[PDB]
Amino acid sequence: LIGWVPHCDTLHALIRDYREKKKILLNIEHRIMLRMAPDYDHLTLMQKVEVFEHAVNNTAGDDLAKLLWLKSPSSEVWFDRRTNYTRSLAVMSMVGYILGLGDRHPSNLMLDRLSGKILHIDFGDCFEVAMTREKFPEKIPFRLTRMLTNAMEVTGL
Amino acid sequence: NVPLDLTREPSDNLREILQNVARLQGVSNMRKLGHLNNFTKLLCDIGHSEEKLGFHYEDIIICLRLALLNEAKEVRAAGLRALRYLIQDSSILQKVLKLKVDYLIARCIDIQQSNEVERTQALRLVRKMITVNASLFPSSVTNSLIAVGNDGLQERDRMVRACIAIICELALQNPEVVALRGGLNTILKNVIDCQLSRINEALITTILHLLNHPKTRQYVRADVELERILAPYTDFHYRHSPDTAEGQLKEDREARFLASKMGIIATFRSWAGIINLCKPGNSGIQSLIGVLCIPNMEIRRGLLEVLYDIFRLPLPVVTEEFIEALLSVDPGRFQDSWRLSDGFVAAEAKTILPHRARSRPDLMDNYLALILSAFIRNGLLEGLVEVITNSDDHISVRATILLGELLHMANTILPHSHSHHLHCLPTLMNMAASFDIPKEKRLRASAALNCLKRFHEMKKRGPK
Amino acid sequence: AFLDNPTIILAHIRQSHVTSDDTGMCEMVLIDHDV
Amino acid sequence: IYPLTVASKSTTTARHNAANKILKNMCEHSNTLVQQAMMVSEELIRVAILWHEMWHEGLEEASRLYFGERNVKGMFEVLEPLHAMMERGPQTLKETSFNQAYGRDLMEAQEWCRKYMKSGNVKDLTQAWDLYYHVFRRISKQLPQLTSLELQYVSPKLLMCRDLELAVPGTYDPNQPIIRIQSIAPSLQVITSKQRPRKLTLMGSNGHEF
Amino acid sequence: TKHLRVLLRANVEFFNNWGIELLVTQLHDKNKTISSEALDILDEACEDKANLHALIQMKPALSHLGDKGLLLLLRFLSIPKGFSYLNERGYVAKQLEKWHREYNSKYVDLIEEQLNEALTTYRKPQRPHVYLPIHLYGQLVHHKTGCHLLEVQNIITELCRNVRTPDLDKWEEIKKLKASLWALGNIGSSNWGLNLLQEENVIPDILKLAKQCEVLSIRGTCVYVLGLIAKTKQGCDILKCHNWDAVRHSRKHLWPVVPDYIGLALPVDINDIFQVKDIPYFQTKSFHLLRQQMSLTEIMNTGLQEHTDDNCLYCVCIEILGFQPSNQMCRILLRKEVLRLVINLSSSVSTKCHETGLLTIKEKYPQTFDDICLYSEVSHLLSHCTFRLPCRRFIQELFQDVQFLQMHEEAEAVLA
Numbered sequence A: 001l002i003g004w005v006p007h008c009d010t011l012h013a014l015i016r017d018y019r020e021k022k023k024i025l026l027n028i029e030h031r032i033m034l035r036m037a038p039d040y041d042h043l044t045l046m047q048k049v050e051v052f053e054h055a056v057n058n059t060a061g062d063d064l065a066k067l068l069w070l071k072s073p074s075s076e077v078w079f080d081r082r083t084n085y086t087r088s089l090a091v092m093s094m095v096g097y098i099l100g101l102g103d104r105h106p107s108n109l110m111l112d113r114l115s116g117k118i119l120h121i122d123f124g125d126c127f128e129v130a131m132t133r134e135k136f137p138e139k140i141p142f143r144l145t146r147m148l149t150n151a152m153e154v155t156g157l
Numbered sequence B: 001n002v003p004l005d006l007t008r009e010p011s012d013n014l015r016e017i018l019q020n021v022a023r024l025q026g027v028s029n030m031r032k033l034g035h036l037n038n039f040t041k042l043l044c045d046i047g048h049s050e051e052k053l054g055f056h057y058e059d060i061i062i063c064l065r066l067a068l069l070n071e072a073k074e075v076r077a078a079g080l081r082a083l084r085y086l087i088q089d090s091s092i093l094q095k096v097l098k099l100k101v102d103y104l105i106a107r108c109i110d111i112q113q114s115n116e117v118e119r120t121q122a123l124r125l126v127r128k129m130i131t132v133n134a135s136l137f138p139s140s141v142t143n144s145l146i147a148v149g150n151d152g153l154q155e156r157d158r159m160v161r162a163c164i165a166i167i168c169e170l171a172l173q174n175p176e177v178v179a180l181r182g183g184l185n186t187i188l189k190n191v192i193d194c195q196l197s198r199i200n201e202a203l204i205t206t207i208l209h210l211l212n213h214p215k216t217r218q219y220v221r222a223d224v225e226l227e228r229i230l231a232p233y234t235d236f237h238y239r240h241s242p243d244t245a246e247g248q249l250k251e252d253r254e255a256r257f258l259a260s261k262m263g264i265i266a267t268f269r270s271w272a273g274i275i276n277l278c279k280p281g282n283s284g285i286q287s288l289i290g291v292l293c294i295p296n297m298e299i300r301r302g303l304l305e306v307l308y309d310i311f312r313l314p315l316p317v318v319t320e321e322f323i324e325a326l327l328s329v330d331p332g333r334f335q336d337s338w339r340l341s342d343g344f345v346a347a348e349a350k351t352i353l354p355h356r357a358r359s360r361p362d363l364m365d366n367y368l369a370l371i372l373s374a375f376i377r378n379g380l381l382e383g384l385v386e387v388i389t390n391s392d393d394h395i396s397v398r399a400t401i402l403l404g405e406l407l408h409m410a411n412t413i414l415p416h417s418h419s420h421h422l423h424c425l426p427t428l429m430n431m432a433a434s435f436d437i438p439k440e441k442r443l444r445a446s447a448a449l450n451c452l453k454r455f456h457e458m459k460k461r462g463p464k
Numbered sequence C: 001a002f003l004d005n006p007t008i009i010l011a012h013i014r015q016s017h018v019t020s021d022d023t024g025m026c027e028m029v030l031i032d033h034d035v
Numbered sequence D: 001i002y003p004l005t006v007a008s009k010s011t012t013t014a015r016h017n018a019a020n021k022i023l024k025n026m027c028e029h030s031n032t033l034v035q036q037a038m039m040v041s042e043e044l045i046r047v048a049i050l051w052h053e054m055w056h057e058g059l060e061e062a063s064r065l066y067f068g069e070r071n072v073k074g075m076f077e078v079l080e081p082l083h084a085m086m087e088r089g090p091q092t093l094k095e096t097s098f099n100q101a102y103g104r105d106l107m108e109a110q111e112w113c114r115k116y117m118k119s120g121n122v123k124d125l126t127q128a129w130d131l132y133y134h135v136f137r138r139i140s141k142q143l144p145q146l147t148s149l150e151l152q153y154v155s156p157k158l159l160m161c162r163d164l165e166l167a168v169p170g171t172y173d174p175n176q177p178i179i180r181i182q183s184i185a186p187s188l189q190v191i192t193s194k195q196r197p198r199k200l201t202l203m204g205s206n207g208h209e210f
Numbered sequence E: 001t002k003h004l005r006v007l008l009r010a011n012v013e014f015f016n017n018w019g020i021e022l023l024v025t026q027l028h029d030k031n032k033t034i035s036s037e038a039l040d041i042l043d044e045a046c047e048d049k050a051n052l053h054a055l056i057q058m059k060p061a062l063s064h065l066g067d068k069g070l071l072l073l074l075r076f077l078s079i080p081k082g083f084s085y086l087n088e089r090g091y092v093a094k095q096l097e098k099w100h101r102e103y104n105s106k107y108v109d110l111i112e113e114q115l116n117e118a119l120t121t122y123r124k125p126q127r128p129h130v131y132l133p134i135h136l137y138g139q140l141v142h143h144k145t146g147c148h149l150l151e152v153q154n155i156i157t158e159l160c161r162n163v164r165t166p167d168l169d170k171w172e173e174i175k176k177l178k179a180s181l182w183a184l185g186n187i188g189s190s191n192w193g194l195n196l197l198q199e200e201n202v203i204p205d206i207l208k209l210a211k212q213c214e215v216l217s218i219r220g221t222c223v224y225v226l227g228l229i230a231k232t233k234q235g236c237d238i239l240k241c242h243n244w245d246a247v248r249h250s251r252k253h254l255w256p257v258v259p260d261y262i263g264l265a266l267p268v269d270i271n272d273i274f275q276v277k278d279i280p281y282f283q284t285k286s287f288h289l290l291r292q293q294m295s296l297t298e299i300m301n302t303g304l305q306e307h308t309d310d311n312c313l314y315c316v317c318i319e320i321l322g323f324q325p326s327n328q329m330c331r332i333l334l335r336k337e338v339l340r341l342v343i344n345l346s347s348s349v350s351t352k353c354h355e356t357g358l359l360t361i362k363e364k365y366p367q368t369f370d371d372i373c374l375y376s377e378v379s380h381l382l383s384h385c386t387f388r389l390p391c392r393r394f395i396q397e398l399f400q401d402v403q404f405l406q407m408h409e410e411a412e413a414v415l416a
């Protein structure tokens, strides 16, 4: 029996609403990679970088950055929410690193609407389990992508 | 072919039984087909014997065995016809079964090679094996008939309703073999997807017969065989077939509701079904009444139609006002047989003026009294009250009339003792006098009694 | 109802199927000659 | 009261006996509290996974064991608790409905498994899997259709509480006056997912919905 | 003719002196349907004593009609003036013999036919009315003189012993029990018929048979015949002692009021009849392993398991007929592979994989499906197991194009 957190929506559905409103396909970056190389899942390490690097340069990743501003009634509220978001993502990144958290896909990452905080759910894969699995082993301490790092502030991380 | 009919019977026998093997050389199938018909004509003249028809029975079966292995559907069909004329008594049947001929009879049942004339001759022979001795029916033929009936609708088989009618006939003289092969399960599943009234009556009667006599009830399970027909109404998401097209899914639900309704009515009209559906312990009737109180809208409308048909009450018209639904139930409403073209007055006066019988027992009132008492004891009256005060505006009107008819049906047919916990409406009155309960509900019950009040006046006037 | 003995049940089975079958098979396979 | 009920419901005998000893001691000073806990615990676990939910998960795992691991002794033990819960009788309309639609096939398929334990013929086991797979296909076609549940259909004992002295789960501290369960909403919604979680809404003693 | 019923139900003045004589001339019409309708509306008219007295004084000829006419002639015995006219040419003594041998049991068929016509959708070749047909034993007890004859012939002793000792095994001796329950219930529909029926203490026997009877059809018949006993105030008191209630009002007033009776009676508790004793269910009383570690080609780099000399198409003919033994390690490892795929096809878990594995054998080795011994083994397995119909047609059709030369050679020789 898990308690229900109010005023929170998952990151994946948050981006989905913004893209569909702007007549933007959900998986434009994914369609580009398959168009350039249909056998993406079988490419070697060096070839996957070429396809991946090409996709991130042909699409500007700022969906989350603009999303948080159109949902702010004023500019004073917008700045306050951004400060909480930046220093709430940093706390869970370092704490999650020690615990060994993995499988942090967008459906398991939730953002608070009223405070801008970051909430993590589904603590199933812990203690470096996902890194040592034979099926698609992830080799990153935590989730820090171009979409998240482009929304905390203009100067970077 | 030239019918000899001149030489001795053994001499006429020798030819066709030599051109039935033929070593698959030097003989055409057309000659074999015409030679087989010679055997049938010959067997009609000389009676079944081993002293006048040359060889013994066991020798004749051997050569006839190499007639069902042919590649021509016309030859195989004529070969089966010969056996039907040869099997007369149990002595021959046990001789035809020892040679394992049943491995080939069941072969012709399921080949599906545009041979509907060959399959009829195979099924017509099975009906003879049942008649001669039903206690020696092979298990090889039985397993073929179950398969063609169990999964014979998705493949568009046209001899599907002709094989179920053979299982039922066999299930009356030899339930032992049918029960092992799951043949009593097939009949239960067929009535679910068979929406023909006359056929649906016949199938359910066969199973209820097995639950009638005390030495046959051992072949039917307790609370899972017969109560399967109640699944479409008790289960809110019923899937009868694991593989079906999703296009007609909505139409499939309506088809199941109609077919299941004809089975529930068909099991409440037999003495072996009333006592089995109204057992003192957990029973199907308590599940059928208990599901009526759940605030569902698709099930509630379906169950009300079943209740009307069980008591054989006239159905009102769909509406949201009580007056419109009351004028459509009066016994004096116009009918189409009252015109000048049809019976002018004699047809009309039959249903208006009362019968001149005040002492003759009405044997149908006795049946309706027992059914009504069974539902009242289980809690039908309390279930209907919940429906009236907690449903849609067009469902409550259909339930208010049913309550009115049942109360009128019960103050003239039920005895004195059963009428003491009847005409008091404890649940209804308490709701309509309490101010604590939500105001909206209070007047729904109060208006319901007001609407039900006018029902008595319509019965008070009578037909006019 | 009193559909109890097999004498009337067999008559009910082989009459409803013949009369109410759309395909022309039950009238051909349920011939009374085979008894 | 919450951790003890979990321990008292464990399969292990050592945990089951030891947990019950503490519970009966608590019955001395506070007997009505523990009885409400068992009733609430037994009903919430019933609502969480239904009879057709248990069979769908058990059959899928059992099929993998028999055809992927070729283990027979491991397949029977998976389906034994599932078949044991059907002999105690349905306690609700939903369980009664399941026992009617799928009851005959499951009960007969158990018998074909009791003949394989003795005869040892492989055909008996194969004939038993013809009924398990037939039922498994029918259940799989109606799981997506499950989108809402009525308390009267699944568990009538929950909407007839109307008062409880047991606190709302997950909220208890010694320095704050306590909140108790007043009532449970008569309808709960199922979230469409692979696990199909439910949204159960309680009613606090101070008029706050949880 | 159909319009003479509206003149009957409307209480036309003096209908009993000009209407009855107009229904007797209509009785001799040429069309059978017209005459058969004149019998229906005359049976309805007979329920008034003034009308019934009119018919007796007219003495019409109803013998030339069928069973419908016979039943209308049996109502004459209920009137003292009509009994003396019939029991004067020696007629009731002929009916008593003729109502005991032949069609005392046929009265059950008449009862069952109307019920099956009312609500069965049977149609032997809107709420209806099902009225109890006239019974000779039930009309002879209206007066003392008629009741006296039914006692000297001593039929009650024969009927009573048939109820206390029922044999509910044969389907033909059960109908004799129904033929006696329907005859005992008609003798109890009158006060003068209850005097000689309660002296043998038979009502408690029927009540026991109405709650503990193995055949549920008899348990429903006793419900109907107990209603006929409740047609009098004296009969409703007996049923009340045994916890059975009844309706104590006629039908002429459909609005009963607290202070001849219609025949209806129900137990005080309806669950006193629906109890049935439980009866237990009748069911209550290798290469397969090795192949999964290797391949078909690896192994290559008697096989019939359940093949005994009674369930084979060819081997069974060695002794009875006089056949010759069949003739012939590369072919012994293919029989196992063909069979083990058949069993795996009986679960339908992965049908496509098993069908593919069976088509390859018929391609690489098309002569392995050319032995009758394998066909018998496969056919014997197709009976015990359960296969789906599409999978059943896949088998038994792989063997279509075979010669089976061994049978033909031996069959030709033995017959010649």
Ligand SMILES: [Zn+2]
Pocket (backbone or CB within 6 Å): E307, E312, E313, E314, E315, E372, E373, E376
């Ligand atoms: Zn052999």
